[PDB]
């Protein structure tokens, strides 16, 4: 719904195991995966609270079922069966619709998180990097593990590399 | 030097249904439906159930001569009766308000 | 069903259930703190992403 998952980022990464969203970097010092702890933590908080909140809205059944009626009490038996079946039908509808709608909303939520992470990195980098379009940025300046870690941590120093990136651009 | 933003994929086969799609494979999921059971009657908060056996509630409450093993039992969590009890009221006749008595004894 | 020596929280005519899950599809008749009976065969809620490996 937001275009990140199955959009400009086509497939997933089986090499990342420590987070739902993260980064894949490749510099002269090597290649590696990392997980965005902040975004994944926010997603875990949201998903946990949503699931639990949905569950506690349904108080656990603390009663019993079962009744018996004689031959001359057919109307009572029909009324009791109608009450039971109607309650079961209403609760089945509630459960099924809730799962469907919440599943769509959860997938949209993860999509939004990936899109927001992409936009955060893009806004930090500005014109110091080139947007290839598959979810990747190609830096116009040489970047080591320190500046990679700055990009992941959000402390990218744009003015420091501005002069070098401008020349290469 | 390149940095790429992406997400997590694994070897799961768990599937969910959405409004837009059916049978969507997902990385993680929770099951909110219980389908399995022990298979045997068990105690509830310690108090043992009262299994009347071959006799029904009428036979239990009138003291049918052919099931006296329920006389000793005085506390229970629930009563278990056979689907078609046979050792009920030995002397034929009508038990007035039988279903009402069952409701009263259910609590 | 036969009688065991369990310490269960829910009892159905087919057997006992020991779960904190909110729903069940075993039997409408229940005794104790039991999940709500539903007629579905699958209620799975997604917590993760789409799997595209």
């Amino acid at each position, epitope marked *: 719904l937001f275009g990140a998952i199955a959009g400009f980022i086509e497939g997933g990464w089986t090499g990342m195991v420590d987070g739902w969203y993260g980064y894949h970097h490749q510099n002269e010092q090597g290649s590696g995966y990392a997980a965005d*702890q902040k975004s994944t933590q926010n997603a*875990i908080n949201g*998903i*946990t*609270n949503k699931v*639990n909140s949905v569950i506690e809205k349904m108080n656990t059944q603390f009663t019993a079922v079962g009744k018996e009626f004689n031959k001359l009490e057919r109307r009572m038996e029909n009324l009791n069966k109608k009450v039971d079946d109607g309650f079961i039908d209403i609760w089945t509808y509630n459960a099924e619709l809730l799962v469907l709608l919440e599943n769509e909303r959860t997938l949209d939520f993860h999509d939004s998180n990936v899109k927001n992470l992409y936009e955060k990195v893009k806004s930090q980098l500005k014109n110091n990097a080139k947007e290839i379009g598959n979810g990747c940025f190609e830096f116009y300046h040489k970047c080591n593990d320190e500046c990679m870690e700055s990009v992941k941590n959000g402390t990218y120093d744009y003015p420091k590399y501005s002069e070098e990136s401008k020349l290469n651009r | 030097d390149t940095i790429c933003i992406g997400y997590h994929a694994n070897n799961s086969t768990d599937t969910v249904d959405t409004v837009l799609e059916k049978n969507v494979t997902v990385t*993680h999921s929770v099951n909110l439906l219980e389908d399995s059971h022990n298979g045997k009657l068990c105690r509830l908060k310690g108090i043992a159930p009262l299994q009347l056996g071959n006799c029904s509630v009428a036979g239990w409450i009138l003291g049918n001569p052919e099931c006296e093993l329920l006389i000793s039992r005085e506390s229970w969590s629930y009563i278990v009766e056979k689907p078609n009890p046979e050792n009920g009221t030995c002397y034929p006749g009508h038990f007035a308000d039988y279903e009402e008595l069952r409701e009263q004894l259910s609590s | 069903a036969p009688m065991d020596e369990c310490d269960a929280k829910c009892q159905t005519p087919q057997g006992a259930i020991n779960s904190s899950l909110p729903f069940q599809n075993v039997h409408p008749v229940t005794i104790g703190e039991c999940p709500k009976y539903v007629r579905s065969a699958k209620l799975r809620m997604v917590t993760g992403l789409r799997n595209i490996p």
Partner: antibody
Framework: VQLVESGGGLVQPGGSLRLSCEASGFTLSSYWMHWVRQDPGKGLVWVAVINSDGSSTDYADFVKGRFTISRDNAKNTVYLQMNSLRAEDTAVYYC?????????????????????WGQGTMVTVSS | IQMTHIPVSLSASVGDRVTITCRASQSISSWLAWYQQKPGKAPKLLIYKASTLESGVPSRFSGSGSGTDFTLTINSLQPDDFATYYCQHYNTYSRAWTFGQGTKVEV
């Protein structure tokens, strides 16, 4: 289900000790295992944690290479080796089990905290 | 992360509502667990996720709160509820396990 601890005793400062928990009633291959300690009369503080495979282990701030954690799922036991002990490390050590998380290590629905604790092994450091 | 108790000690009579408040140095969402320890014994877990009750714990216990401030309430205090209560911030992700200083409930 219970956890039994052994190995606690009196050790001189700058010594070594090995504490062990054995679990009965459940297989601990599907549980994170935690080591906490309580000073006599004081509160509870957390020492170490070991995963369900032994790959990921974490230790508290006051222990800097002094302690090493280990686990044997086949034998249903979890071990903690303390070396270079000091007088501060004098307390009752508890073994706690924590359910493995549904997603990563986070449990979304079900038990989440330290459900089952040990009995306590007293570790004394003195001359 | 630091977790603090209010009050440090709290004396109340039997049958009286009690309230222990645990405050965090940051926002820890609903990652709280309330434990109870009687002298010379291992703690027993009362509440997890700041609202959910462990199986077997009496319903007289209640949990409440999110973010930075949380609360355990023992309505209808009973003699077996005189112990030391601990609030623990647990986060398997980010690997953060921290215990509170502790509160004492006396007569």
């Amino acid at each position: 289900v219970q956890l039994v601890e052994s190995g606690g005793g009196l050790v001189q400062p700058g010594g070594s000790l090995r504490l062990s928990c054995e679990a009965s009633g459940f297989t601990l291959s599907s549980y994170w295992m935690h080591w906490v300690r309580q000073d006599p009369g004081k509160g509870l503080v957390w020492v170490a944690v070991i995963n369900s495979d032994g790959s990921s282990t974490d230790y508290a701030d006051f222990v800097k290479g002094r302690f090493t954690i280990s686990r044997d799922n086949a034998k249903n036991t979890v071990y903690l080796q303390m070396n270079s002990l000091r007088a501060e490390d004098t307390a009752v050590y508890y073994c706690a089990r924590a359910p493995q998380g549904t997603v990563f290590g986070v449990v979304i629905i079900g038990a989440d905290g330290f459900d089952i604790w040990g009995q306590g092994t007293m570790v004394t450091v003195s001359s | 992360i630091q977790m603090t108790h209010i009050p440090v000690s709290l004396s109340a009579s039997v049958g009286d509502r009690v309230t222990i408040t645990c405050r965090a140095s940051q926002s820890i969402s609903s990652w709280l667990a309330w434990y109870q320890q009687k002298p010379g014994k291992a703690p027993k877990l009362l509440i997890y996720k700041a609202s959910t009750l462990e199986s077997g714990v009496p319903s007289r216990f209640s949990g409440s709160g999110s973010g930075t401030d949380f609360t355990l309430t023992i309505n209808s205090l009973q003699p077996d509820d005189f112990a030391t209560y601990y609030c623990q911030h647990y986060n398997t992700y980010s690997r953060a396990w921290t215990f509170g200083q502790g509160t004492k409930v006396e007569v």
